[PDB]
Design a protein around this ligand. Structure first.
Ligand SMILES: CNC(=O)c1cnc(C)s1
Ligand SMILES: [Cl-]
Ligand SMILES: [Mg+2]
Ligand SMILES: [Mg+2]
Ligand SMILES: [Mg+2]
Ligand SMILES: [Mg+2]
Lengths: 194, 194
């Protein structure tokens, strides 16, 4: 029933733009919306990847590997799945494994890759692939993981046990000023609910 | 170590604005970021998203989701019921209200997250994730009345909790919809648990 009629640029930065979207509603009436888009999406199937990294080690409980960084939009520190934008020509899987190594030091193994999923669809067209990766923490490659941050990347690694993830996140939020990401929280809530 | 120095308005719509954020990197170098914010916040968070667990005896437990056209996406998305929190509304009340408006179901609060970020590399947007149970055997949820506001057009899709991720992939394959990242993350963790 519904579709886009026109997309009028309001303001274009180097990374993000704002558009006036005109669309047809299902009564047959024309309406508008304010839409955010990135300027960096070329032929990628999504803007970015977020990695769900399951750290597996003999005689350890499985951990979920998370990262903590300063996020200028939020004006503060956030706890997130490792993530980054997909480089031109790069596959989502390759982007995931690369970002996971850059942000955490770990070399993972692909498990699964989602279709493109929407970040905040009432606001933006932004999409990611959610890529589940296992990390063999018994491998020597992953014994001394050194994050290789790119320019302006400053990332702390936080590994939390899967079997207590929500409470461990709660305990971090209780101790400092820091926001947990909605996908991380959602994943932690389902681990509780299962 | 990191903090905001200043924020310069680039462009302000009725609902969304774009800013150029100046911040201090951990080395003492000053850097800029393009940030999006909503113009609507007052509140604990911009919005709520509801995880609605429909419980009917002798049936599988379902998670109630909504399908709507999303102008920034140019398409239909599958999402947790959700909306912005009204000035002077609590997140719990916003959650029960939105759930009723979007689905017609009347639920009970199970738990409420702290404010969690939507896409912290892009925006300051936050929500509370509110887990709600729905007694599907109660008379008031027999023939649920969805009460849309002006210009809302929402379809309800109930999916079994125990097979959520496979049911979502199926919808994506057959119906060319985009699943929401928080929905997909929750679905993943239901499979990954134990
Ligand atoms: C790296 N510098 C930037 O200004 C941005 C990157 N991603 C954005 C949404 S803004
Ligand atoms: Cl529950
Ligand atoms: Mg990143
Ligand atoms: Mg990165
Ligand atoms: Mg809504
Ligand atoms: Mg509503």
């Amino acid at each position: 029933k519904q579709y886009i009629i026109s997309e009028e640029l309001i303001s274009e930065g180097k990374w993000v733009k704002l558009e006036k979207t005109t669309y047809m509603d299902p009564t047959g009436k024309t309406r508008t919306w304010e839409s955010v888009k990135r300027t960096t999406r070329k032929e990628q199937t999504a803007d970015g990847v977020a990695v769900i990294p399951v750290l597996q080690r003999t005689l350890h409980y499985e951990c979920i590997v998370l990262v903590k960084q300063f996020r200028p939009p939020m004006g503060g520190y956030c706890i997130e799945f490792p993530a980054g934008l997909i480089d031109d020509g790069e596959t989502p899987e390759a982007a995931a494994l690369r970002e996971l190594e850059e942000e955490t030091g770990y070399k993972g193994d692909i498990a699964e890759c989602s279709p493109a999923v929407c970040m905040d669809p009432g606001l933006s067209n932004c999409t990611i692939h959610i890529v589940t990766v296992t990390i063999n923490g018994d491998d020597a490659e992953n014994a001394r993981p050194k994050p290789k941050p790119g320019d302006g990347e400053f990332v702390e690694v936080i590994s939390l046990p899967k079997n207590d993830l929500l409470q461990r996140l709660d305990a971090l939020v209780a101790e400092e000023h820091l926001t947990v990401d909605a996908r991380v929280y959602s994943y932690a809530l389902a681990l509780k609910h299962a």
